[PDB]
Amino acid sequence: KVFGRCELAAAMKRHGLDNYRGYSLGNWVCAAKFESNFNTQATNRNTDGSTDYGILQINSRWWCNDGRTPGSRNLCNIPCSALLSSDITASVNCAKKIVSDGNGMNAWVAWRNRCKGTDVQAWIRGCRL
Ligand SMILES: [Cl-]
Ligand code: NA
Ligand SMILES: [Ru+3]
Ligand SMILES: [Ru+3]
Ligand SMILES: [Ru+3]
Ligand SMILES: [Ru+3]
Ligand SMILES: [Ru+3]
Ligand SMILES: [Ru+3]
Ligand SMILES: [Ru+3]
């Protein structure tokens, strides 16, 4: 599924990301925009052989199992395929674990490079939330 900007903002709020770990909803929408352009089916292979999955491009190196990332962990205890669903539950629940693990949203390199320190509230401007 490709979410609309406000559609995803609303969904993320429903799923408990609105100010999760002190990150305002706009941060999460911004991160999704640049990680996946709001497309739940996004995948991207990394140079180390791991793969990023879903709306928040969660990496098989640490967070999910895809059966083809030798030496990897599955710290969210999910198949990476769960992260491609039209329903964002699995992605959100795993993202909560990720953002709580020490580095906050710096875990998402596109968030650090494209969202951090910007007016992220712009990403939810106009949306019925
Ligand atoms: Cl933080
Ligand atoms: Na893994
Ligand atoms: Ru939902
Ligand atoms: Ru809010
Ligand atoms: Ru709110
Ligand atoms: Ru990545
Ligand atoms: Ru950990
Ligand atoms: Ru931990
Ligand atoms: Ru503003």
Side-chain angles (χ1 to χ4, degrees):
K1 175 174 170 165
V2 176
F3 280 82
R5 174 175 69 81
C6 291
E7 186 184 13
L8 180 60
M12 292 179 147
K13 180 185 192 331
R14 165 56 190 163
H15 290 246
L17 288 180
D18 191 14
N19 221 36
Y20 189 83
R21 209 77 175 186
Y23 289 96
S24 66
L25 191 58
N27 283 287
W28 296 103
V29 173
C30 186
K33 171 71 177 180
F34 294 127
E35 289 296 354
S36 66
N37 203 12
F38 302 142
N39 183 357
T40 69
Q41 296 195 84
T43 60
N44 286 290
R45 198 82 191 252
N46 303 310
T47 44
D48 66 8
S50 68
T51 301
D52 296 340
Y53 298 85
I55 203 140
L56 286 170
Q57 289 290 278
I58 291 176
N59 192 353
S60 66
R61 176 59 55 198
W62 303 110
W63 305 106
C64 60
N65 181 56
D66 67 7
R68 64 160 207 195
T69 312
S72 82
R73 306 293 293 279
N74 177 10
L75 292 165
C76 288
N77 309 115
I78 46 169
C80 297
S81 64
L83 300 166
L84 304 182
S85 173
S86 59
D87 185 284
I88 70 173
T89 297
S91 282
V92 168
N93 287 347
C94 187
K96 287 177 181 176
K97 188 184 295 294
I98 294 169
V99 73
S100 304
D101 231 27
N103 299 124
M105 289 194 78
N106 296 292
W108 290 277
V109 169
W111 179 86
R112 185 174 44 82
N113 289 329
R114 306 183 72 174
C115 300
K116 188 172 182 186
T118 74
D119 191 345
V120 293
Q121 294 59 51
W123 289 101
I124 67 169
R125 186 193 293 119
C127 305
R128 191 184 298 112
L129 307 171

